[PDB]
Amino acid sequence: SGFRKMAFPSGKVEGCMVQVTCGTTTLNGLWLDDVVYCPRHVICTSEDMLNPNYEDLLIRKSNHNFLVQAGNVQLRVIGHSMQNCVLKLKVDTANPKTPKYKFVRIQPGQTFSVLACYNGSPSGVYQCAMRPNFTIKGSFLNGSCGSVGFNIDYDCVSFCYMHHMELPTGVHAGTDLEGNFYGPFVDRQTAQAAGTDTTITVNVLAWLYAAVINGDRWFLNRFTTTLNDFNLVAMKYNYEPLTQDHVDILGPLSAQTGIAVLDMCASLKELLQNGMNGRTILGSALLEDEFTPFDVVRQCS
Amino acid sequence: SGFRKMAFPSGKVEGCMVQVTCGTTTLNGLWLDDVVYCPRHVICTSEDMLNPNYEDLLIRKSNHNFLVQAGNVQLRVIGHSMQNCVLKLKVDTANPKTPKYKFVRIQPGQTFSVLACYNGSPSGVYQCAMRPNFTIKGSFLNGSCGSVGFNIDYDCVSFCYMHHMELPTGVHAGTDLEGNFYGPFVDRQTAQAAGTDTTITVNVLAWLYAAVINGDRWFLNRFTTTLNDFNLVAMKYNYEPLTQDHVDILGPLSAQTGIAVLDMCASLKELLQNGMNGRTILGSALLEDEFTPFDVVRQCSGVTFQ
Ligand SMILES: *c1nc(-c2cccnc2)nc2ccccc12
Ligand SMILES: *c1nc(-c2cccnc2)nc2ccccc12
Ligand SMILES: [Cl-]
Ligand code: NA
Ligand code: NA
Numbered sequence A: 001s002g003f004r005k006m007a008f009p010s011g012k013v014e015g016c017m018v019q020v021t022c023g024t025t026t027l028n029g030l031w032l033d034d035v036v037y038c039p040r041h042v043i044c045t046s047e048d049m050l051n052p053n054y055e056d057l058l059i060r061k062s063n064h065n066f067l068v069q070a071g072n073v074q075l076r077v078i079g080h081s082m083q084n085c086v087l088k089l090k091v092d093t094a095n096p097k098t099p100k101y102k103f104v105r106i107q108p109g110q111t112f113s114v115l116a117c118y119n120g121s122p123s124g125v126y127q128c129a130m131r132p133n134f135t136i137k138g139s140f141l142n143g144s145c146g147s148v149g150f151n152i153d154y155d156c157v158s159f160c161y162m163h164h165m166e167l168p169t170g171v172h173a174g175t176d177l178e179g180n181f182y183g184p185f186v187d188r189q190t191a192q193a194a195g196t197d198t199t200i201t202v203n204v205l206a207w208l209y210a211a212v213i214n215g216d217r218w219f220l221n222r223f224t225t226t227l228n229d230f231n232l233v234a235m236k237y238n239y240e241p242l243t244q245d246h247v248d249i250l251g252p253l254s255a256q257t258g259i260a261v262l263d264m265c266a267s268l269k270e271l272l273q274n275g276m277n278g279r280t281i282l283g284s285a286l287l288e289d290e291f292t293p294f295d296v297v298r299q300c301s
Numbered sequence B: 001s002g003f004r005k006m007a008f009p010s011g012k013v014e015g016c017m018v019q020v021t022c023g024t025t026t027l028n029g030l031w032l033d034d035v036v037y038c039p040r041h042v043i044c045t046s047e048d049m050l051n052p053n054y055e056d057l058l059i060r061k062s063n064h065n066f067l068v069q070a071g072n073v074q075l076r077v078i079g080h081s082m083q084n085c086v087l088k089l090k091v092d093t094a095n096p097k098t099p100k101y102k103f104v105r106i107q108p109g110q111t112f113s114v115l116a117c118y119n120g121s122p123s124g125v126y127q128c129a130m131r132p133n134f135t136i137k138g139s140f141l142n143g144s145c146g147s148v149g150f151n152i153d154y155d156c157v158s159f160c161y162m163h164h165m166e167l168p169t170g171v172h173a174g175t176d177l178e179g180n181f182y183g184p185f186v187d188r189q190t191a192q193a194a195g196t197d198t199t200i201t202v203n204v205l206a207w208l209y210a211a212v213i214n215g216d217r218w219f220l221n222r223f224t225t226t227l228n229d230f231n232l233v234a235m236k237y238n239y240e241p242l243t244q245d246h247v248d249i250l251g252p253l254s255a256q257t258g259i260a261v262l263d264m265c266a267s268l269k270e271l272l273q274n275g276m277n278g279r280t281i282l283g284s285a286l287l288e289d290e291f292t293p294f295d296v297v298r299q300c301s302g303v304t305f306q
């Protein structure tokens, strides 16, 4: 028992992290088979910050303008192309530590592990969620761009995020591994701002089920609600709407605990109305929204 | 920007985890050079665990009674001995992925990363503090015993914890890698309970510094205090004493942020006396105590572990 924010073991990803340099710009890349993936803004100068023409910048580069260092060794770059906002560098060695992998684009609410890296070397691993406004709340310093986010549900690594930049509010934006941004952001230094963030309701419900599984009952009540009445209240506290999809996904936890999803919804309504009155749930005095239903089942069972 | 509960990258430890079986007992071991370390209770069944005589159980055992699997390969056990509450199994092959490592014993308040494993297979990584009552608040299911905790200092892995068991309250107990328990526990199935726990003061102060570095400043105030006055209040709230050594260790953060340690103590005094008045710090409504001063400096400065 116990319930903790837990990341995936990072070793399969560590064995893929390299350093990429172009001019005076250094950042991280991801070496899989014979391709290194990194943010395309590695080719920008100080001149280029607001309105880079990446196609124009890239045509001006040769293979030998890219320095790729893997541990103590330089890899030879033999090709380059751009896909959306990611640069792909073909190298003359396949990474012998390449794991089974795939690229997946995720939806808001989904969780993943981040391996924060600097100069191609791993610093630490933590757990994140894609927020409803398509940002993540990470921990990232200068040079961290090109660090990735991932899941590993079996022995296959699913890469879902590559870090590009920090917005003025201190939250983080990036792409999938096909180079498409999450949310309305662009890899330019023009003014951009995320939407007001909201709480991931289905994840809060999952976490309340985790609490029950771990022996906590104090917040339960004898009421139920309609889905529509729940959403009308929840929205007043900046909670995301709960859809019928989300109700269905919570079905297994409901069956395991004997508490109907809409019964649990009424417990959540009460918590929003009353606060915790000096109590905690699983060690927290706030409701936690960065555990998915899948995460709860994996960690509890 | 940003501040998260962060574990060390686990790859160097992952390459050391194996499965150990003795009879119908399976758990995890740590393979370093030509020795596999695991809990001694691998030699026990249920009834054995009521009142085990480990010496007597072990003397009866053949090398071939211990099955060690590393991935899909069996290792041959050629010897066995016990040290305190850990079993050491000599094997005929050195682990080629053995990292640079040491065994260390940590103190209450220190943090480490746990690599949770099942059947010799790493499943999760999280950060824990050794509580003042010598428990850890982990997340561990059946089969998790033998999972290890560690830090990385430069390129050296410091192993500090091996997981043995869960107490009735759902918190966790284990040993150092020389098999000595943290805390007043024994490896038998009997009623055992940890002492009342306390809050790790020096770590709460560290986390308040992290908050300030990240722009969260509302709890700062114009006041300072004395170590003695602060320690009287801490005692009242079941906080550990702050020593002069703790003050010294926070010195760098004080210099960097312009808030002296006893100035920060006066902030903490007020928070304990008055609460947070609806506000949060780094997204928390409780004071967090599982970040050390070293952890805060590392994460706010980007130290790496190639
Ligand atoms: C890449 N990423 C960052 C960065 C800084 C803060 C938060 N997220 C990302 N900064 C830089 C600076 C220079 C070159 C690359 C790069
Ligand atoms: C080892 N450890 C545990 C255990 C279960 C919950 C929390 N911590 C440790 N349980 C088992 C069960 C069977 C064999 C080994 C083992
Ligand atoms: Cl004063
Ligand atoms: Na690397
Ligand atoms: Na209810």
Ligand code: NA
Pocket: B220, B221, B222, B223, B224, B262, B263, B264, B266, B267
């Ligand atoms: Na003050």
